Design a protein around this ligand. Structure first.
Ligand SMILES: Fc1cccc(-n2cnc3c(NCc4nc5ccc(F)c(F)c5[nH]4)nc(N4CCOCC4)nc32)c1
Ligand SMILES: Fc1cccc(-n2cnc3c(NCc4nc5ccc(F)c(F)c5[nH]4)nc(N4CCOCC4)nc32)c1
Lengths: 295, 295
């Protein structure tokens, strides 16, 4: 298998830059438009094609702050193809660039936007279900200060689009995302709701604070092995132990998310305010100057 | 593009586990033998096929301590196929597992074997040219204490197999490996020799000591951009600055490697002895107990 220079007649395919849920991601060019893009590919022979479903979720999400624009989705030869707005580096990339050390200021600035992105998704009737640093990207140019959220391949509806009736409490039957950032309820095999995305973001923030999480594991392990080893450790590590030595707001955040009822509407503004209050007591300036901008 | 359950009739193909030079790596089964293996695949439509060349280098290297066994190489359909002995996790995987903290004891134990692996390659007339944590794997079972070296896709001959006449001093024309661990001479566009592999190992050891290197960069960059940004930083960072706060042996090692002549035979035993002397002054026990064994 070699990639041609083009995907059909309209798209130049450049280098593979990483992976997403159920597909590989490439740089490319929309040749007719004269615009650089990102392209996600799914092999049509896959047992359960989903790219088309994912693309419809992107289309529904359009217009939200920090949601990439979808240009096209369809088939070309051996692939389904989804063409997206090109963005800046992922937060995992930028964390590495900063030697896996983010300042408290940068953590807080990121937290504010990340909570807002998640809230937006929830406003459109979906749970993201794979909250992780790789799925948040900075923008380009004048939007270099804006955090975007990506990847709707594991996203699932939590309320009816018309009635806003919440899904029933139930066991999970959906494919799941990273064990590392999964909520405790996810490890227990329970359906995710709004609280679970926010709990997972809490683990992401602690990862940025610490550089690692205490349940880090080995890639040379099956998903089954990872869930089991991480479940056991995450379940035996209190929030107060995880968050020791950091501002109390991180533990207050995590405990709030874990104490939500399955169908509660989270108080997003209260969660933002935790961090914004801390930001101002610290004497920080809300100036869009992240750690990597000083590199 | 989907992988069938088998690569031809003899090999079960399991999950993709990572990448190597010019190809992807999969778990698999040699069905006739009833043995688990690792499989490297190269698409036959690639501009410059090299897997067959790489396989011949493996065959030449056979019998060395910490060299994986090669089972077969050949064509199957749209792929060239190279079937290898299955090993344990990479040193990068294990570093992550240990939260990017290795004890001085583990660093020293690894250094001793890594210098020996490199020496072995040199004894067989090749420079490895991509010394990095991902290319060292632990063994399995009773060989769980043994470090293996892998990937000969960038390896190049530095002396004639019959005469042992060293190649002439010259500019490089070969594809190169990771900018991160490259020798300074590699950044200058000069042909690599025995000293360069050892210099690169020095950077690897410092990476294990520090958790990062001070020229760490952003994945969202072209190879050209990475070479240029890393060259400039690596070139303006003295060894004594890189190695500050660590045992002097790390700086003594790096300065020794940088002071070798292009055609010098390195004093491998002197380099090993640096670290072994330190090990004993520290009071450490040579007991094969690495950090990850305490996890
Ligand atoms: F499929 C989608 C859906 C929505 C948006 C995007 N999308 C829109 N812009 C991007 C984007 N741009 C930043 C980037 N440029 C790079 C070049 C080389 C390199 F090595 C990298 F690491 C790179 N990272 N990066 C990614 N990826 C990061 C890598 O892992 C897969 C995701 N997805 C994108 C892709
Ligand atoms: F192509 C060759 C040539 C010579 C030896 C090998 N070779 C022989 N045993 C292996 C091997 N075994 C350890 C392993 N098992 C894993 C399962 C899932 C997972 F996610 C991993 F990370 C895994 N790591 N790992 C690798 N790789 C590590 C990943 O990056 C590509 C290299 N190459 C191997 C492969």
């Amino acid at each position: 298998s070699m990639m041609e220079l083009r995907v059909g007649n309209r798209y130049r395919l450049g280098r593979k830059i990483g992976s997403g849920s159920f597909g590989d991601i490439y740089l490319g060019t929309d040749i007719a438009a004269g615009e650089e893009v990102a392209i996600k590919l799914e092999c049509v022979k896959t047992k359960h094609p989903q790219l088309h479903i994912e693309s419809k979720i992107y289309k529904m999400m359009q217009g939200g702050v920090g949601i990439p624009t979808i240009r096209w989705c369809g088939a070309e030869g051996d692939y389904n193809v989804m063409v997206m707005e090109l963005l800046g580096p992922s937060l995992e990339d930028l964390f590495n660039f900063c030697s896996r050390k983010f300042s408290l200021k940068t953590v807080l600035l990121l937290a504010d936007q990340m909570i807002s992105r998640i809230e937006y998704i929830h406003s459109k009737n979906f749970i993201h279900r794979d909250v992780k640093p790789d799925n948040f990207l900075m923008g380009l140019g004048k939007k270099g200060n804006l955090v975007y959220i990506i990847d709707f391949g594991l996203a699932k509806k939590y309320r009816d689009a018309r009635t806003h009736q919440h899904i029933p409490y139930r066991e999970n039957k959906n494919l799941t995302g990273t064990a590392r950032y999964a909520s405790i309820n996810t490890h227990l095999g329970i359906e995710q709701s709004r609280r679970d995305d926010l709990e997972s973001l809490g683990y992401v923030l602690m990862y940025f604070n610490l550089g690692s999480l205490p349940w880090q594991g080995l890639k040379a392990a099956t998903k089954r092995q990872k869930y089991e080893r991480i479940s056991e450790k995450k379940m035996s590590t209190p929030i107060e132990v995880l968050c020791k030595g950091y501002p109390s707001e991180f533990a207050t955040y995590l405990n709030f998310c874990r104490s939500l009822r399955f169908d509660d509407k989270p108080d997003y503004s209260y969660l933002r305010q935790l961090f914004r209050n801390l930001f101002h007591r610290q004497g920080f300036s809300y100036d869009y100057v992240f750690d990597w901008n000083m590199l």
